[PDB]
Design a protein around this ligand. Sequence first.
Ligand code: PLP
Ligand code: PLP
Ligand code: PLP
Ligand code: PLP
Ligand code: CL
Ligand code: CL
Ligand code: CL
Ligand code: CL
Ligand code: NA
Ligand code: NA
Lengths: 398, 399, 398, 399
Amino acid sequence: ENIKKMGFATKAIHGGHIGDKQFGSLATPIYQTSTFIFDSAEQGGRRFAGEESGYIYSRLGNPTSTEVENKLALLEGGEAAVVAASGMGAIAASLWSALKSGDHVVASDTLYGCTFALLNHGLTRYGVEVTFVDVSNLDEVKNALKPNTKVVYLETPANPTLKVTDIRKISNMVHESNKECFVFVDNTFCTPYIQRPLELGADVVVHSATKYLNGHGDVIAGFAVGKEEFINQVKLFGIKDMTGSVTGPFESFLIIRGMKTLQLRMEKHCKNAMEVAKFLESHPAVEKVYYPGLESFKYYQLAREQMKLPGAMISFELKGGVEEGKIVMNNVKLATLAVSLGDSETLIQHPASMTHSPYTAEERKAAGISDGLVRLSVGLEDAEDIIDDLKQALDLIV
Amino acid sequence: ENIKKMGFATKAIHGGHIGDKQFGSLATPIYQTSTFIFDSAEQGGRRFAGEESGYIYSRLGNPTSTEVENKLALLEGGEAAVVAASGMGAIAASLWSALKSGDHVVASDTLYGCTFALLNHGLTRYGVEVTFVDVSNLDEVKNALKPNTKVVYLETPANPTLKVTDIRKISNMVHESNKECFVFVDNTFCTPYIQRPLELGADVVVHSATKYLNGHGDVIAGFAVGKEEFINQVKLFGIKDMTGSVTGPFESFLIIRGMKTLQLRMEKHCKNAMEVAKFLESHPAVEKVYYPGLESFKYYQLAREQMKLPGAMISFELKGGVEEGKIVMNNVKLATLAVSLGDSETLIQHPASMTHSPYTAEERKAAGISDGLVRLSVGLEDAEDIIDDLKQALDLIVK
Amino acid sequence: ENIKKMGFATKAIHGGHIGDKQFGSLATPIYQTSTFIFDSAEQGGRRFAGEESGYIYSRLGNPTSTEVENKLALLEGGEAAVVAASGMGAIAASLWSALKSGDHVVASDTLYGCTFALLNHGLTRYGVEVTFVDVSNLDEVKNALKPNTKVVYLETPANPTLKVTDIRKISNMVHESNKECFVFVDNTFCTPYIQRPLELGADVVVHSATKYLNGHGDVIAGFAVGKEEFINQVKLFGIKDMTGSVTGPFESFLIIRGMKTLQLRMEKHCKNAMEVAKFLESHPAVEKVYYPGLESFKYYQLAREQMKLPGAMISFELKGGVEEGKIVMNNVKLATLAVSLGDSETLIQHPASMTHSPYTAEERKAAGISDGLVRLSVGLEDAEDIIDDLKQALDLIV
Amino acid sequence: ENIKKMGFATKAIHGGHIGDKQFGSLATPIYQTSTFIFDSAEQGGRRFAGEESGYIYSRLGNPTSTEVENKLALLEGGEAAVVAASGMGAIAASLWSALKSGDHVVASDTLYGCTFALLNHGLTRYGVEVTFVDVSNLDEVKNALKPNTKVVYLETPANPTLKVTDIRKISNMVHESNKECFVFVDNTFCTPYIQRPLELGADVVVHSATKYLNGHGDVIAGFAVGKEEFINQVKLFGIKDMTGSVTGPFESFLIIRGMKTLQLRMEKHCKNAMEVAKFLESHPAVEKVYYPGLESFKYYQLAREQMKLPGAMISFELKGGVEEGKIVMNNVKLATLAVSLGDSETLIQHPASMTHSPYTAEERKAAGISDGLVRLSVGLEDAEDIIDDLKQALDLIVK
Ligand SMILES: *Cc1c(COP(=O)(O)O)cnc(C)c1O
Ligand SMILES: *Cc1c(COP(=O)(O)O)cnc(C)c1O
Ligand SMILES: *Cc1c(COP(=O)(O)O)cnc(C)c1O
Ligand SMILES: *Cc1c(COP(=O)(O)O)cnc(C)c1O
Ligand SMILES: [Cl-]
Ligand SMILES: [Cl-]
Ligand SMILES: [Cl-]
Ligand SMILES: [Cl-]
Ligand code: NA
Ligand code: NA
């Protein structure tokens, strides 16, 4: 099994799988254990010294987690991956390992709300300078770069607007002018099936596994993906010391299980979303549809440059404010009123009347997060059913 | 009911249990879910705006985790608790939530290794200043206090030799010297069954639930306990943003399950360890035994004031060095060669040839570790079997 | 949610889902509990009397299991379903509830090996008469029917030959002549996505959920599906008393999770199998391919009569005996040498050198289970990878 | 090691543990897998042909389940054991594996309800003949023996009133009267910590592990224990074909976890129940208490011969009837209204208004159930709290 030459599905299914060498179990065993047994004091000493392979203690590493790490690194085309007990855990642990007091970060002004809060209010308590910029005007990006800029943090498509960012072109410019700077890309919305930021110049990829990679709405987990040199530091410092964000081995087993169908779900998510997006664009209550697959969309061709599929997140604005948005939220029958995304169940959320949250009213005016903006996570249901349900709720405001 | 007034076991078994109101199931359901459903758009807005309690999303809170949080707070006598995905996660999230660049921490110079690394190499990287002190020398502690000291961090009994710290004296001291200073006490080795730092004047208690609280060697998890106001910031800042240290609902279920027998397990751990410590002190291969229950122990009296039982951790020094520790390790048959503790299986490590193998013999003497020190977590087995196994191993190094 | 009018995927995803009315959890909670609490002695007495709804004790019923039961009944078009701790558990419990000492069974002579053993050696220890017949010659079927025939048991397509059986036409004839007789159909190989035997005249459907319905090779479970009147007896007698085959609530949660992608997996299983079957039919080491989707296949048009898709099990005979079969089993690199079926991983098994098992050498001569017969469970991998691996192993015997 | 020679707790904790040979993990891995991989086509043929041990497919056997099977066999002193997906599953699979149409069973007339239903209404439907007897009257037992009697089925102590059966006398009798007869003893209420029927001459022991063996109210499971030769047929016939009663590897993991504290839990269950039984007998609302540890108990001496401890089940009759039982049930605040037993939470049921509500007052008198009988499973709470809660409930019916 020189797995790396094979298809995506084969890699998702068989990649990183070591095998139960003692009983021959087909399925990955759940090594639900806190600690590990040494055969000798010498073997222990050598595991602690780095001389020998093998396991010590589940905060430091666990066989079930190792497999899903190796599987995702393989899918992203990265040397190494670390799995964490949440997406924010993988992001924080990566940021802690890469930065120190006095370093500087350039971030996108359009981010997942808790990433913005981590950057805006968290890292800045601890001596890290942060500048939020429009990643669509590279001159703005290039002028934010200071001699001590260590991370450029980007998310594409961006939660909640689906704004797309030229990964190759920011990476090139940053790498030309700041040789010490990492380019981080949050690839949650895409998964490696749709977008592989490491092939476009990114140095570090982060995911909320809570979303598409697990895919079943029963796991909180994250990953960081990148060079072995740096991921090793994320494991031995960001996770071991700074965050203690240890994925439960049972949760790792569930991510492995969900990744068995990652190819099939992303294909179905996206075919559903494209039908839904076209419906929304033609409905009389809708003013603007935000979707990478619509030719009307501002970042359509940047999406076509980086994304195999337009994805399965849709945002749209109703004619009418928050009030018409609330009316739709409160009368869908198949769509589920919840945050998160990437589940079998279609999810709908209305930042304007709920999570407008970690941003101030002004700070999301800058990012383009209007009231009346609805965000839709298109599920795996039959598309006619999703559309019928959206249609009945939208007809209420016509 | 008056659950606060009941016995300890009644509290461990029944405390924090909200109940399954839809189907009445006896066991706490595993709410293995990432997200939650809102009844209206406005309900979700109220919950995100702090105007209303209720669930939103498991990184911010989960019903299974809430239950074990409520149960441990009740046992510690604290107002609130947060469970994290590891001991270090609960420690780091608490420290992050109380500190900022420009703050100062006073810490014991005798701590769990990874706690020490986080303090010495981690927080100092981010503008926090840390002074390490010998907590036995109260005058040396009061001297290290600065006006920006925001955390005094203690661990008692501590690694690797079970040094005990006078919780009430130092906190009484710290509190009248600086009104804004949190006193942290790591209470892993004791659990609330043996020691309750908050009633001794501590502000925040941290736990590695990986050890005795879960007690079954199948969970990595942590807790912090204290005032509702601070724990809310540990949840909404330290967990939500800074660490992402989210316990799996499954792991919280297992911790709940493990806590049903905490009273019973702590009693047996301590009964066994008292017998093992007596035997080790009388054995000819053994130079010194560190056990709070032995009247030879330097902090015997102070431990007898703070701890309901002398615990079940044991450190002892062999007459000998690395080669001696290696032989004992490589010949125990019931005890298990493994780091960690608080397990039903008796665990044993020899740091000089194992955990502290990478360091030099001199650096290991800077960490309190002789070449003959052995650390012992006494399990739930029959004491005669534990002792017999230790006896034949140690007899191999008697001259 | 009048769910029954919606698409298959929507039903698989949302069907049977009650909802967490206390905390609003999206995912089904795991009610991992032995017993349930009464609010009053009166409420207890009424639950035991049948007067009140609600739960008593997990052998009698469990909320997590109730949901996957209701979900599968909805997909099959049956009134009720019971989930069991194995496929054999659902089959035995159904058979125990329907039969008594002195009743008679007509069964197909081509069956899953342990079903044959249950019928041939198990029920006959306990006074049940059993006659094994060729379900392809209805005159043979009709002549086996005795006045005391109570079950006609059939499996289509049959493990291991994939022989197809006219469900509508046996059901009609049996129902005309033996008004007291149940028609059981094992629908494991198809799932309700491909075949709905209750719509063709069957009275009872059984599944090994261990295979496609769970789909992830980490669960042993079964179902019976049928009229409420009879399923209620299976629950209160077959499961409660005769087998004690109680699905663990955690396993039920895993089946629910696997059914979220049942539509997507069956589509992918079958498109893969059709490509593999055509490859096998053209390879010089292969003498005969057994696959419903091949026009060469004996039961092609009976398959087209009953099956939306030709399925994803393939059997084939090599030119050469067991010896060439073993050579292929021992040199595949991506296919996994294991029994079971319906997993993400392609599985290959060689009854001739392994499980030829519960049949005698003669009894499978009658059913058509030759040596040199290989059975293939086509997985979810990329088809080129599955075919490349089969090709290299088969080339060894050319 | 000489695990057979060690103490009980050492056996419960370490017994049957094969070990994770690939990674050395301390906890038993959850082998949550349906199927297994063969190294060659011929290896799979050897395993299906009984020529070779090893795994095939989880309905035939799973490594997590094997471990808990080995552990329980060791505790009972039996050769082998099979775990099933419920108590009834292990009972039914054993009975199926030993009987056939034309066989005869002698059973106690005082059994667990669903066991009785299976015997009286289930097996008789399939040509098996069943005679129910009073096992206290040895002459009535020997009289019901027939040449085709293949099972003598016992349960001691039994529902609902804790009748004790002389295991060694009846089995000694049965064995010299009929050489091919299996003696079954249901050992649920005791566990191997208290009673071991195989050393008293029984052939097969059955368990509902749902009760004390798991002990945490989150598993439905069963066991049968006995000679390797019979248990192999229970596995390869009774489980594989006749019942399909396959334990989830996850459930087996939980039973293993629960058994780490079995010794500790049985001690506390019994200490608490002895205090609860004394209090109940002295209480004015209580007519009679059925407890093996009370010298008033009809089978006190026989129980003292067979049982290491008097157990933790308690039946008692109220001075009163259905209306009295209802009031007590509807006013306990710590005890839980629920069927089942062997849980860390104290459980209580009043059969006349609850489990046996569907039957008439006369049929319930045919089942040993007065209108004032209450069944009590004493938990792991503090005894004062259990008693206080029972006291205020019972005081509501004192004249
Ligand atoms: C939800 C989300 C996260 C947060 O990850 P968690 O698993 O919730 O900690 C991070 N990035 C993006 C783009 C998200 O949508
Ligand atoms: C093991 C330990 C910790 C760390 O907890 P983890 O759960 O391993 O992250 C902290 N303090 C003490 C005393 C410990 O023993
Ligand atoms: C594997 C199989 C079964 C047996 O079900 P289990 O889940 O293994 O008990 C029954 N029917 C068919 C067609 C099978 O392939
Ligand atoms: C509960 C019980 C059983 C039945 O076991 P289940 O696991 O519920 O199927 C059998 N015998 C006794 C004594 C019991 O208490
Ligand atoms: Cl989100
Ligand atoms: Cl540790
Ligand atoms: Cl199979
Ligand atoms: Cl019961
Ligand atoms: Na989902
Ligand atoms: Na699979």
